[PDB]
Amino acid sequence: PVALVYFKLQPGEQVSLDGKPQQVTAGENGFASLNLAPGRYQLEIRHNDRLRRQQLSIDTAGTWLVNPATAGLEGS
């Protein structure tokens, strides 16, 4: 079983999965994708000190659309 995961990315944002750098580029309308096998992955999207994070839990085949939230938001 494999799944596609889509997320919004801006040029200059760095994507890591489980700490491992991923050379993905945003496409039509700033959307990027990863193809993942069943399992849990720590998605991190960094823009300088800005960190957006989401745990991806892949089990069945299909497509995920995700909007990782910003960690440590001012006001939290």
Partner: protein
């Protein structure tokens, strides 16, 4: 507003299209590859599928029906070939029903579903001159009911808005309606 719907693909290669804006709210949408999903020769998703949406402490699991890649809620046309006359971030107009060609369904975009949902609004194009005959109104509306009722996932409240011409150029395509006939 002026933004176009974004295309996304399933692993198999079929494409769907909807509005997804980055609200960095931790929200998620999962469309499983399912046995009821079909791909059109045009490469657009068709068929029905149970979707899983999660955001702000709420999970929703609606069965959506795809037409030309567009996710629709509260409507299931099975295999019927319909046409999306107009689609935008606010509303989608469903037409191309050969059984009632001058009738349309209005579906408003539901942000939490990332899909267009039917909330009872049907539009019937009829000359105002013809609407001077309660019998002719009843027959046009009976025809629209017969053509659209089978597609109502849950047979639901159906109100027919009579207009002289559909305004696909407007946010409210039934603006200018002169008569409202309740359905069933």
């Amino acid at each position: 507003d002026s933004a176009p719907a974004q295309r996304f693909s399933l692993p198999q290669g079929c494409h769907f299209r909807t509005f997804w804006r980055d609200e960095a709210n931790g929200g998620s949408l999962f469309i499983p590859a399912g046995d009821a999903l079909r791909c059109g020769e045009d490469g657009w998703l068709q068929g029905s599928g149970a979707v899983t949406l999660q955001q702000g402490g709420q999970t929703l699991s609606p069965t959506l029906w795809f037409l030309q890649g567009y996710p629709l809620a509260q409507v299931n046309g099975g295999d019927r070939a319909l046409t999306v006359v107009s689609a935008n971030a606010q509303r989608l107009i469903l037409g191309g029903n050969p059984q009632a060609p001058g009738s349309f369904l209005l579906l408003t975009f539901e942000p939490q579903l990332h899909a267009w949902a039917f909330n009872g609004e049907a539009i019937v194009e009829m000359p105002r001159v013809d609407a001077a005959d309660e019998t002719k109104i009843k027959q046009r509306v009976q025809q629209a009911q017969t053509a659209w009722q089978p597609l109502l996932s849950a047979p639901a409240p159906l109100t027919f808005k009579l207009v002289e011409k559909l305004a696909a150029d407007r946010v409210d395509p039934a603006s200018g309606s002169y008569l409202s006939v309740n359905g069933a």
